[PDB]
Design an enzyme around this catalytic site. Structure first.
Site, mmCIF file in Angstrom:
data_model
loop_
_atom_site.group_PDB
_atom_site.id
_atom_site.type_symbol
_atom_site.label_atom_id
_atom_site.label_comp_id
_atom_site.label_asym_id
_atom_site.label_seq_id
_atom_site.Cartn_x
_atom_site.Cartn_y
_atom_site.Cartn_z
ATOM 1 C CG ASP A 180 -2.171 0.904 0.977
ATOM 2 O OD1 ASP A 180 -2.009 2.008 0.414
ATOM 3 O OD2 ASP A 180 -3.293 0.503 1.364
ATOM 4 C CB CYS B 53 -20.683 -5.848 -0.170
ATOM 5 S SG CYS B 53 -20.824 -4.189 -0.850
ATOM 6 C CG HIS C 143 -24.643 -0.293 0.910
ATOM 7 N ND1 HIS C 143 -23.383 0.079 1.327
ATOM 8 C CD2 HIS C 143 -24.505 -1.503 0.318
ATOM 9 C CE1 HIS C 143 -22.518 -0.863 0.995
ATOM 10 N NE2 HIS C 143 -23.174 -1.835 0.384
#
Lengths: 329, 329, 329, 329
Positions: free
Chosen positions: B32, B148, B175
């Site tokens: 990262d 998801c 959501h």
């Protein structure tokens, strides 16, 4: 028209605020279990609707709002209210305690001519929803204005059913937090989900608004049912209506039909937008149903999901006054 | 199985956390754009999932998690990652930047054997969803785990379609807030609604999860579409699926069919409850789809609304690891 | 030690949860105005603390928690509780209704030997705070554990006063939302601010915790006072203590003094961190006072602002059990 | 006075909104990296301040607000802005990128006469705060309006210091969420706490506002420092100032002194209330500092904690315009 309010809760307070901007309705008396100075504070300051746009002062246990005196009382039994003295024509029943005929008729024995319940009836007292069946009022002396969610669903459902015919529909309302909920997990013995912390949770909830539409629109009797999700917002909710149409209709035909009603016979009741709105954009919305053109979606010409916003306090309260004026014609 | 993570965001971090509790998968390297000490802090403390249940220390620019050393890098171009040195078999592509074949294949040129994208593909890279079509994996070297919401909808949709046949379906997901949203009204040029303050608003949003189900379940191709409402909760979302069934089926038949799959061939993927649950009750849920028996409602035997919860971080992350193990068999 | 809980609210429930992880204390009976099946639901699911880590079942109107049976009652008057039958030594008074001697002594007439109030006393019942004055307990049969905020302030104040001498101090606690508050603007006649919507507002509030420290630490009597701000978080609060010291002391001397107590005679009561913590990092904190080294600031060697976190449910509840065990020695 | 805005963020937009209600200032040009239609949307709808009270339309890539045309640009380098064409006298520097002299002077080379930075200076550009030191402006061509928190603290601190003499002071601001924060735990490499989810957390934060007061009020140089807690509210913050006074002064003397300034030489800058206010009661507050009489508390005549509210967007923005008008006299 002289009107008295019983119950200075969320609905009673915003009914009062909205009535100030009207020329046909005068609030002359309020009744709640709270002192007048506290009632003044709750009117002056509101976390959702901002400060009262007017003057509030307490003089000799009564309220002086914009120069006019309002008789304040704190009677628990509605037979005692002595509505005669200040001469009130219609009473707004906003406590939620008195949603039958025998409950609310004590207002009429106390001197009022008619009463409007700011909630759905529990007996068979007729319900009326502007845009739906105000034109079917038959001079009854006690009426109900249904609920926040019905006032959003029914005008939309009427437009859809009249132009395309609803075979069947399933409804979800994403509802803002209300006074019935808890700040943290606490007791709510008749609705266990409803007692869970409101700011932490999406909370499923039952609702009778979809079936109640069958009462104000008898054509749709038995064709709609639904449910709700309570979410951590302070005000403004949204209806999500999934319907089957007998007559094929593209999404643009549905938009045009709703826009036509919003600009025509349902102006000020049903609203219409194609903008990128979110819920706060309707904080203060007077329309009880604002169709969200871009949020809705169609799977095909006979199966579509329609989205409509409502300020569950401001729209409902303004139509309570519309019902008060309508039954006084 | 030795695995490397690229992107230590929400998904990469919880993929890492979940992998710790597994015996078949070892995280050996992370990449990262952040220093290792910062990456340690983001792993130790999480506002949604609590403190890391283990030891984290930084030694010579690398991470020591539970005694094991993890090679930390900060390379922007995935060709450079030199996956050979730490010998990684599968790479979890959790940056969101590399959702094509040419994007992610640079991981394979860098020494990895296969890669799993932690998001829906943008080209035609095959998507796989546990409970839906893991059994259709055909040895491909680059795969997607869908999204998801798809991981919640597809297992439920398969059970409903296999037992009763879905003619057509419309879906709404309520959501929780995600990293793409803003704290206050701010710029979001590709999605104007999405830039409005997330804590103040119900925000309508587009979604491709309902149509993406047609890819993992070709039987349902073209029969589902949907939308979303973003609400101010930090985690856990809920699918609201309105379907027409060709075969008549009472609600109790639907409950029994879903409960059977949840206790049988879909154990650990599809869950089932009849309790008075709210969203926080699934913070940490490993099942990607928990059917809420009492929140759903049927209008009749062929038109029903079904409700299913998902932890959009924990369930998805655990199934990313399941896909990694599955493609390594 | 056998203990009974009266009041299954936030504090009673987490006292119950924490007692499960202890070897010296056994919960044998609970009393609240709720049915046992509802009490089971409130124990199994918690929006703040997650699912109960154990088994809960209802058998013949009683609770079976982790195999052990717990006698459930619903008596409104504490004289009736018949504490003799299940043989309880100490009773945790967690209703908030019985904070005097005559109130709580009805537990002792009902068969209990001693009682601990889970709130600050309203008469002169002695208050005890771990780290402050547990060593001054003189065998009294009814005691108070003070309040959440006192349990955070007093151990910190003792360390500062013992090492440097507090001349005077002003305190602010930024407090998470509690059960006393409202979801939207609603009636709260004894505290008008406290009735305003908790999720929309920073709400100033009075507090007696700073003066109550003078009772548990008589040296500081009359030298501290304070106030509070209620903010829309579900749990975890923070004390902000601004003090004048008689003895000059750099900030590093203050850090070292607090860290020494946190690692020494106040281990497990007073905590210490130099990390970049936020409030959720202490959800579940057993320490009643975690000094935040980097959040505090000094203007000079005698005028400093000190910051300390507390989980207002978990820390307080664990120390209620510590007081129960301490008075049973 | 003709003015151009650079940066249409939170501050630039509300500076624009407030300028509409003024007779001495005309917004003629705006510059931001966003298309004009998007800029129109961000002006029309605001989740915190409601819908724009006016007309907004886009014509030929420019904005028409209330009939007046506003030149829209999207130049990244401030030398290019060609401020000459629309003839702007003062430029409001609201991007946050250009807080030096060399940064902002490119506005003057681009045709503007003077510039006001809507943030604290990073070099030694003079800062001015209304109520504090507007009367010390010495014709400088580039100035700063300090920060939201300084504009709240400095007028209060001046009144307290002028009447009673501040020996030393420690400050805490409980600050509403701002655009710099994250919706969920995300990267914030220069401020690790600031990257944690803003809606879930109380987040400690550094602040230079207390020391910056020493620049606008040289008497208080070196006598104040402070810190901040970020809390999940969308707007409105509150300063909590703990001070030692050289001259003894009861709390009623402090109230009277602040009320006198609020009704006198600091009318419209410093406000005063004794009501039971909460933060939403100041959404839209034009005063940069509203003293909360009942929230403050005194330990004795020389050690007191003072509380003052500020709308961190509305007050600051209105005083940016006041500074623009003041430097144009």
């Amino acid at each position: 028209i002289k009107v008295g309010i019983n119950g200075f809760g969320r609905i009673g307070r915003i009914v009062f605020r909205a009535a100030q901007k009207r020329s046909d309705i005068e609030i002359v008396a309020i009744n709640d279990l709270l002192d007048a100075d506290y009632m003044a504070y709750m009117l002056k300051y509101d976390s959702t609707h901002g400060r009262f746009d007017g003057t509030v002062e307490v003089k000799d246990g009564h309220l002086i709002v914009n120069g006019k005196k309002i008789r304040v009382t704190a009677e628990r039994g509605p037979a005692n209210l002595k509505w005669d003295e200040v001469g009130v024509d219609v009473v707004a029943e906003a406590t939620g305690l008195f949603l039958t005929d025998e409950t609310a008729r004590k207002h009429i024995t106390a001197g009022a001519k008619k009463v409007v319940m700011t909630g759905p009836s529990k007996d068979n007292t007729p319900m009326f929803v502007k845009g739906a069946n105000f034109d079917k009022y038959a001079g009854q002396d006690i009426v109900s204005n249904a609920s926040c969610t019905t006032n959003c669903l029914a005008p939309l459902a009427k437009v859809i059913n009249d132009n395309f015919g609803i075979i069947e529909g399933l409804m979800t309302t994403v509802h803002a937090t209300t006074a019935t909920q808890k700040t943290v997990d606490g007791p709510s013995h008749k609705d266990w989900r409803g007692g869970r912390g409101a700011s932490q949770n999406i909370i499923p909830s039952s609702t009778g608004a979809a079936k109640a539409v069958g009462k104000v629109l008898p054509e749709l009797n038995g064709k709609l049912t639904g449910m709700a999700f309570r979410v951590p917002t302070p005000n403004v909710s949204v209806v999500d209506l999934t319907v089957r149409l007998e007559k094929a209709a593209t999404y643009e035909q549905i938009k045009a039909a709703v826009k036509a009603a919003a600009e025509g016979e349902m102006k000020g009741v049903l609203g219409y937008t194609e903008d990128d709105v979110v819920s706060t954009d309707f904080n203060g919305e007077v329309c009880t149903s604002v169709f969200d053109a871009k949020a809705g979606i169609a799977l095909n010409d006979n199966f579509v999901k329609l989205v409509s916003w409502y300020d569950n306090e401001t729209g409902y309260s303004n139509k309570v006054l519309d019902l008060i004026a309508h039954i006084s014609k």
